Amino acid sequence: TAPVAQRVLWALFKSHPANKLSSLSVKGARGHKSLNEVLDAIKVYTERHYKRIEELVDESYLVEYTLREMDAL
Amino acid sequence: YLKFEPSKSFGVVVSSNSNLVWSGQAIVAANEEVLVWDIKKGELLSRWRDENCKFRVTAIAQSRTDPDVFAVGYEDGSIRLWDSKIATSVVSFNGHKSAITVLAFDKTGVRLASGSKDTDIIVWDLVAEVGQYKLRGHKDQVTGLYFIGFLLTTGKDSLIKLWDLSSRHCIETHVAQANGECWALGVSPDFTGCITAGNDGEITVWALDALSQSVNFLQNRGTLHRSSKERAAEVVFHPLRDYFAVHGVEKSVEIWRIREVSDVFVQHVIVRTTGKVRSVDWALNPGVKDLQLLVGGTNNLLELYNIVGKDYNKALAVELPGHRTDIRSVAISSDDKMLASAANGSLKIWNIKTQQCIRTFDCGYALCCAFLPGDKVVIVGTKEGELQLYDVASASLLETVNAHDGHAVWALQVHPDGRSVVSGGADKTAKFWDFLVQSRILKVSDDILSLRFSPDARLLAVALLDSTVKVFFNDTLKLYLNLYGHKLPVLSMDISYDSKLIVTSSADKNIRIWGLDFGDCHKALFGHQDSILQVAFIPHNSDGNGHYFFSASKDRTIKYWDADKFEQIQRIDGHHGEIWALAVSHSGRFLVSASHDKSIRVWEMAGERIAEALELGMTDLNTIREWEEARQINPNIAPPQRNPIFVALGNIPAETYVLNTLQKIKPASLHDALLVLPFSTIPSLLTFLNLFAQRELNVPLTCRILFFVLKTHHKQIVASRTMRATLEKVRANLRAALRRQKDEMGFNIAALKVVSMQLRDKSVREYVDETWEEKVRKRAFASLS
Amino acid sequence: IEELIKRRILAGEFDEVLRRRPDMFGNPHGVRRGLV
RNA sequence: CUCUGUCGUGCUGAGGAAUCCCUAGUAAGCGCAAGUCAUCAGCUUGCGUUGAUUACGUCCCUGCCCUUUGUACACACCGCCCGUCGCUACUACCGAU
RNA sequence: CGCAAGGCUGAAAAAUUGACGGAAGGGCACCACCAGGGGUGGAGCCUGCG
C-alpha cells in the first residue's frame, strides 16, 4: 500500500500550505505520536521508496535500448 | 436377541415449541410429528411424521396462495416441505447449522425464508430445490422474518434489518431497544405498519414507505407499553380486520385495535387464559362475526376463543387426548388392554389398541399410581401424604386415607397375591394396609424412596435416602440383609421373577446387579450420562428371557440390558425430555414410557498455470474488444459473455485476474516459472504488461518481470518484427507511470523536508541565557559476540 | 517391556540428552542479539 | 596374469513370477593368513591382488522431515494461509424442584 | 521391640496453553524417480529360524 499512501499524501500536500501543516497543533501529541516523529517516519520511508523507483527507471531504459536495436535492424 | 421398536405415541396436544397455524383445522407441533386437529370435535385429522428424522419440530408455516403445502422447521436445522393431501415430506432443505426458529413465505409462494438460531437467514427457491443464497447480519439470533422484493427481519440484538434481495446485502438497519432485546415482530398485511415487541413489555411502532443518497425507509414513529412486563412471545396481526394480538408466555393475551401513537393504538381486550400460553394464532371463520383467537398453551392445551369487536368466551377446547402438566407414573392393567397414567393435576386411563383415553379424574399431585388386581380400582399416592382410591367402572372417587401427614408417598406396591398394599412415604416410616385397614407399620432410619416385593412374596426391599437398600423378610420384618456401594441415593429398584437378582438404580448414574443370596454385587455398571430414574424387569420367562431389564434415564434414554451376559442388548432413543416413568407388559411383549415431553410411547505447475491464465485473459480481451466494436457500431443488445470462471469470481477484468495469478506465487518461483515460459506466450505477456503500465498497479512487479523477459529473450525480440508495436506501447506506458510515481514521491519528500525545517524553526528555543547546554534518537542494538 | 514403554510415554520421562545452548557459559540468560 | 604351441562345441546348458540390494578403490573376480573370555568350523574375521558400466540431476511417482511462532539488525523481498471443535468470561433463553 | 499392619468392599484428568486435520511452499532418501549392475528365487549340500 505504498503507492496509495503516497498519492493521497501528495494530494494532501498540494491542498494545504506549509505554515498550516507546521503550526498543526492537536492535543494527542505525546511521545511517539508527536508531529516531529510522524513526519520523520513518513520522510524516511518515502526516501526508501524513491530510491527504489530511481533504480527502476535506471533499469527501464533497457526497453529504449531494445527499440533502438530493432530500429538498427 | 430380539430388539424393540417405537409403535405407538400419544398423550400430547401442542407442545412448548412455537408457531401454530390455523387452516377449520388447527395445525400444531408435537415433539417430532406435526399433527392436525379439528377443533369442533376433538378427534385429530392426521399426523405428519418423517422416519428419517428424530429431532423435535419447532416452527410451522402455511404457504400463502396455496394451502396443502406446508413448511416445518426442526431443531437439527432441517426444513421439511410437507403436503396436507398426502402426508409425505415432498422435499427437504438441510442448510442451516442448528435450530430453525422463524419461517416466512413469499407473496407468490416460490420463495421461502428461514431464520435460525445459528443466526444465518437463508432464502430458498421452490422450483429448483437449491439454496439461493445466505444473508448474514445480526450479532445474535434472529426472532422475526417477513417478506415485503424486500426482506424485513429482526434479531435478539435489538436489531431490525431491512434487506435487499436484488443485491444480497442489507439496505437499512435500526435498533429498537437501547439495552434490551427485540423479541417479536408484527407486520401489517398492507406493509405500512410494523411493530416490534421488546422485553420490557414495550412495543415500538414503525412506519414504512411503499441508493447512493441517504436512504431512510423505516421510521421509528414511537413507543408504547403493554400491561405485562414479560418477554412478549409473539405479535400477530389480523389478515382482514384492524386488530392484532400481543402475548408473552404467560396467562394473558392482549388484543389491540387499529383506528399520537398512544391514541392510534388502544387496548381492546385482555383475555385471561387458564395456563401459560405458548403461541396465539389467528382464525377467521366462514360465516362468523367475531375473532377466533386460537391459543396454544404450554400446559398441553388448545383453546379457541371468540372476541367481539364493536369480552371473551371460551368457545372450544382440545384437552382430552393428553395430560395437562407432566406424567409422573404409569401402571398398565393385568390384561394389557388399558393403562393408568398419573400426572400432576389429573389421572387419565387409556385403551392401548385405540391409543385413546377412556376415563379421567382430578387428583392434586400424583407421585405413584397402581391398579389393584381384577383391574377395577386404582390407587394413587400423592405428595400431600394421601392415598386416594378411584375406579374405572363408576368413574368416581371411592376412598381417601391419610397415610402420612405432610410427607410425599414415594413408593406404592401391591402385594403379589393382591391382598395388601404398601406405602413408603417421605416420613421415617412405611405402612402396610390390607383390604383398607392398617395391618402393620415399619420404622426405618431415613426417608424411604422406593420399595418392591418379591414376585414370590418372600422378601421386601426398600431403598432409602442413606444411599442404601435394606431387604427384609415378608412374614416378619427382620433385617435380612442390606446393600451399600452407592454414593448418591438409590432412586429405583426391581427384582427378578424368581427372586434371584436385584437391579438397583442410583442417582450416581449407575446401576448394580446383586445376587439376592448373600447380597453380592454381580456387576456394577455405569451406563448413562445422567441420573438413572427407573428400572424394571420383564416378568414372564416363558419366552426364555426373564433376566432382561430396562432402565429409563434422565439423559432421555431407555437402555435394554441382559443381566446374565451383563451386556446392553439395545439402546432406545425417541424421547427428548427427561423421562419420568416406565412400565413393562405382564406379557412382556411391549412396554410404555412417559416423558418430560408430556408424551407417552408404547414400544413393541506454476509456469503452466500462468500460461493458462494468460490464454484465458487474452481470449477475454478478444471478446471485450469485439463487444466494444459491436456497441460502437450500434447500441443494440450484445452481451460480452465472458468465461464462467470470470463470472464466478465476480466479473473482475482479466487484468486483475492475471495480476492475482502473477502475485500469488513466491518470487523465487516467479523467477523459475517466468524462465519456464515459452516464446509463444510472450506476446500475450507483453500485452498484459502494457495494460498494467497503462492502468498502473504493482509497477515493481511489472518492471521486474518485464526485465526478466527481455533479458532472457533479447535476441529473439530484436530479431522479431511483431514485437515492435507492443514494445513501443509498453515503453510509453511504463515511462509515463514511472515518471508520474517518481514525480509524486519527489514532491512528497520535498514538502516533507520543508515542513520539517519549519518545525525545527518553530521548536528551536525561546529564552536566552548563559545555558545553551540544553540544546536525537538512540537505539540499543545488542550484539552477542 | 511394552508396559514400561507405556508408563514412560504416559508419565513422560525420556532419557534423551537435551540440546543445550552453545553459549550458556558466557551468556546465561540468552538475550536476543538485535533491537533492544 | 602374460606369452608360446596341440585339438576343436562333443548330459563331455547361468535359472520364471516376484522381491531385495548397490553409486569410486563401490559392484564383481581371485587366493593367503589367523581362530583372540561373547559368536564362529557346515564357518567367522582379517589381509593383499585385479578393478569397470551408470546416475551423481529431480521432487513428477512413492514416502520421510520441516516451515505458516519464536532464535539477529543492514541492503533486498514478503505480506493479514484455511476447517471442525474443545476450555474460559459475559449475555439472555427453555423447562422440572 | 514398636509403627507401618483394620476392608461403602467383591478382576477385565487438565485447558485462556487442549484434540484432529486441509492448502500452499521447501528439504531429504538407491526403504524414491531415472540408467545400469548384482543377488535370492531353477538342481544338490547343509547351519539356522518357524
mmCIF file with all atom_site columns, N, CA, C and O in Angstrom, chain C residues 1-7:
data_model
loop_
_atom_site.group_PDB
_atom_site.id
_atom_site.type_symbol
_atom_site.label_atom_id
_atom_site.label_alt_id
_atom_site.label_comp_id
_atom_site.label_asym_id
_atom_site.label_entity_id
_atom_site.label_seq_id
_atom_site.pdbx_PDB_ins_code
_atom_site.Cartn_x
_atom_site.Cartn_y
_atom_site.Cartn_z
_atom_site.occupancy
_atom_site.B_iso_or_equiv
_atom_site.pdbx_formal_charge
_atom_site.auth_seq_id
_atom_site.auth_comp_id
_atom_site.auth_asym_id
_atom_site.auth_atom_id
_atom_site.pdbx_PDB_model_num
ATOM 1  N N  . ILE C 1 1 ? 8.183 -55.132 28.706 1.00 0.00 ? 1 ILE C N  1
ATOM 2  C CA . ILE C 1 1 ? 8.837 -54.024 28.017 1.00 0.00 ? 1 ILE C CA 1
ATOM 3  C C  . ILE C 1 1 ? 7.800 -53.088 27.413 1.00 0.00 ? 1 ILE C C  1
ATOM 4  O O  . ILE C 1 1 ? 7.935 -51.860 27.481 1.00 0.00 ? 1 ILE C O  1
ATOM 5  N N  . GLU C 1 2 ? 6.734 -53.651 26.843 1.00 0.00 ? 2 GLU C N  1
ATOM 6  C CA . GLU C 1 2 ? 5.670 -52.821 26.292 1.00 0.00 ? 2 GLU C CA 1
ATOM 7  C C  . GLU C 1 2 ? 5.002 -51.993 27.378 1.00 0.00 ? 2 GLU C C  1
ATOM 8  O O  . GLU C 1 2 ? 4.692 -50.814 27.170 1.00 0.00 ? 2 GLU C O  1
ATOM 9  N N  . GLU C 1 3 ? 4.813 -52.579 28.558 1.00 0.00 ? 3 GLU C N  1
ATOM 10 C CA . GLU C 1 3 ? 4.226 -51.833 29.659 1.00 0.00 ? 3 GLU C CA 1
ATOM 11 C C  . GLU C 1 3 ? 5.150 -50.729 30.147 1.00 0.00 ? 3 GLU C C  1
ATOM 12 O O  . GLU C 1 3 ? 4.674 -49.652 30.519 1.00 0.00 ? 3 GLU C O  1
ATOM 13 N N  . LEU C 1 4 ? 6.459 -50.979 30.181 1.00 0.00 ? 4 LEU C N  1
ATOM 14 C CA . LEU C 1 4 ? 7.381 -49.934 30.606 1.00 0.00 ? 4 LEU C CA 1
ATOM 15 C C  . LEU C 1 4 ? 7.403 -48.792 29.604 1.00 0.00 ? 4 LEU C C  1
ATOM 16 O O  . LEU C 1 4 ? 7.496 -47.621 29.989 1.00 0.00 ? 4 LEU C O  1
ATOM 17 N N  . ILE C 1 5 ? 7.299 -49.112 28.316 1.00 0.00 ? 5 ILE C N  1
ATOM 18 C CA . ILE C 1 5 ? 7.186 -48.065 27.309 1.00 0.00 ? 5 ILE C CA 1
ATOM 19 C C  . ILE C 1 5 ? 5.911 -47.263 27.517 1.00 0.00 ? 5 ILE C C  1
ATOM 20 O O  . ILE C 1 5 ? 5.922 -46.028 27.439 1.00 0.00 ? 5 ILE C O  1
ATOM 21 N N  . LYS C 1 6 ? 4.802 -47.943 27.811 1.00 0.00 ? 6 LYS C N  1
ATOM 22 C CA . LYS C 1 6 ? 3.546 -47.229 28.024 1.00 0.00 ? 6 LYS C CA 1
ATOM 23 C C  . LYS C 1 6 ? 3.615 -46.333 29.255 1.00 0.00 ? 6 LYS C C  1
ATOM 24 O O  . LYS C 1 6 ? 3.136 -45.193 29.223 1.00 0.00 ? 6 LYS C O  1
ATOM 25 N N  . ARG C 1 7 ? 4.241 -46.818 30.329 1.00 0.00 ? 7 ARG C N  1
ATOM 26 C CA . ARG C 1 7 ? 4.420 -45.994 31.518 1.00 0.00 ? 7 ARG C CA 1
ATOM 27 C C  . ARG C 1 7 ? 5.262 -44.767 31.220 1.00 0.00 ? 7 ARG C C  1
ATOM 28 O O  . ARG C 1 7 ? 4.908 -43.656 31.631 1.00 0.00 ? 7 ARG C O  1
#
